[PDB]
Amino acid sequence: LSVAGEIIGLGNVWRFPYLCYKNGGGAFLIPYVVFFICCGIPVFFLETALGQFTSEGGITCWRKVCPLFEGIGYATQVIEAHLNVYYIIILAWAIFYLSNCFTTELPWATCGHEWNTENCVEFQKLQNATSPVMEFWEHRVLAISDGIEHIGNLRWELALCLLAAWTICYYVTATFPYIMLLILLIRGVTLPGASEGIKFYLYPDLSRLSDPQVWVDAGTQIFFSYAICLGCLTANNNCYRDCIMLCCLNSGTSFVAGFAIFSVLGFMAYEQGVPIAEVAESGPGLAFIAYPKAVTMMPLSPLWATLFFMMLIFLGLDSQFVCVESLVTAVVDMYPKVRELLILALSVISYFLGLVMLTEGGMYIFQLFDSYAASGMCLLFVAIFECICIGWVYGSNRFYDNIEDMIGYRPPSLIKWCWMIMTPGICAGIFIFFLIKYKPLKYNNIYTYPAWGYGIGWLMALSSMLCIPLWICITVWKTEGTLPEKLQKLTTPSTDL
């Protein structure tokens, strides 16, 4: 087969290099492999198999079996609702950058502009060293207003572009991202003084394993393709495409993207005479600094500059479409009568709620949204329970019989063993590790949020996670009358099969 399909997504290009750079580089890899050998693959296989067997996606798949975990279907839905709001701000900045690439000379190549301070060394021929590209990102695209307390005015230029992003509602791109990634990687290796960039990326620092923050983000980063919309399958023909097509390439693509991006960071460190650890911004705008610089230092800069942001827009568009359309079926799941007015109203509310994180102080809010909602500990708690339902309540050996009927072959025994033992155990250990030694989140290792900022983040996490206990309380409340002897009927799966 070896069909291209769509694997690049957006986490590989943007999310992974941003997380790897902030955690020290090589020390980020050891959690990645540890949280991959059977903490990410068997869970993916489990959700795919459960979606295939019941042929239903959403909350009915977790309603047919283990009604204790019907709250997972509700908790998953809240995750997607949180994700859809803050995942469109990425498309906003890309549109703005694309609007400045249709000129003779890009604004970040040179200095001397009104959004540029007097300390702008051209850095192509040393206190207060500052590159023009970072100046363009920090003083023109979004101006951080020194703290979450300050909000300032509303960025009208980004306001229109965000509305342009939300206007789009309801081909040759099969290998277009891959070709551009390959040519960027070819250039990234080529520049002089890029050997130090790879050395920082590969060799790990073993002293960083003590910090709980390094474990939690990578373990949640590997979960970026799960617990949202992969539980709905409509294909059997599952075979073993669990990690032949949908997997084992996402990690490889992330590794290649990190190889390509980190090389350019070495060149900037070489030019500025500063260690690589403190040459760029350790925030979500990392992909908006390294890549534009690489496009700047290569022939035909505008032509290859307009294509990169275009491919980023294309990679965001399908993901946003999938999330918005999948959420609609959850709302219309009851289907009383149903005129696409639900879709029309969902876009307006989502757009009117995204303007909060678009002001001068709205960059900090995007950090709180990214670290806690649709990431952090939210999917760790859900991953603990989703393995428990199949592992113990329903039955792995009886589920293995179902997959032997469907696929035709019995899967290896190790899969179910670590399903039961290590997959929830690793997550529980990491959760307890985080709570034992709490590390408050600091922005760019510069700014520490006030107490109410962590309060808002923890409130988002609680609103994501507390669905299951409430649902089990309600379900136990709706009892026949035998309060001690009532788990029997609940634990029994649906007999409609």
UniProtKB/Swiss-Prot annotation:
Summary of activators and inhibitors of this protein: GABA transport is inhibited by SNAP-5114.
Transmembrane region(s): 1-19, 27-46, 71-91, 156-170, 171-186, 222-235, 244-265, 298-317, 341-359, 376-396, 417-436, 456-474
Catalyzed reactions: 4-aminobutanoate(out) + chloride(out) + 2 Na(+)(out) = 4-aminobutanoate(in) + chloride(in) + 2 Na(+)(in); taurine(out) + chloride(out) + 2 Na(+)(out) = taurine(in) + chloride(in) + 2 Na(+)(in); beta-alanine(out) + chloride(out) + 2 Na(+)(out) = beta-alanine(in) + chloride(in) + 2 Na(+)(in); hypotaurine(out) + chloride(out) + 2 Na(+)(out) = hypotaurine(in) + chloride(in) + 2 Na(+)(in)
Tissue: Widespread distribution in the brain.
Keywords: Cell membrane, Glycoprotein, Membrane, Neurotransmitter transport, Phosphoprotein, Symport, Transmembrane, Transmembrane helix, Transport
Top-rank lineage group of the source organism: Eukaryota
The protein's name: Sodium- and chloride-dependent GABA transporter 3
Family: Belongs to the sodium:neurotransmitter symporter (SNF) (TC 2.A.22) family. SLC6A11 subfamily.
Sugar-bearing residue positions: 128
Biological processes, Gene Ontology terms: amino acid transport; gamma-aminobutyric acid reuptake; monocarboxylic acid transport; response to xenobiotic stimulus; sodium ion transmembrane transport
Keyword Transport in record: yes
Bilayer topology: Multi-pass membrane protein
Subcellular location: Cell membrane
GO molecular function, one term: taurine:sodium symporter activity
Function: Mediates sodium- and chloride-dependent transport of gamma-aminobutyric acid (GABA). Can also mediate transport of beta-alanine and to a lower extent that of taurine and hypotaurine.
GO cellular component, one term: cell projection
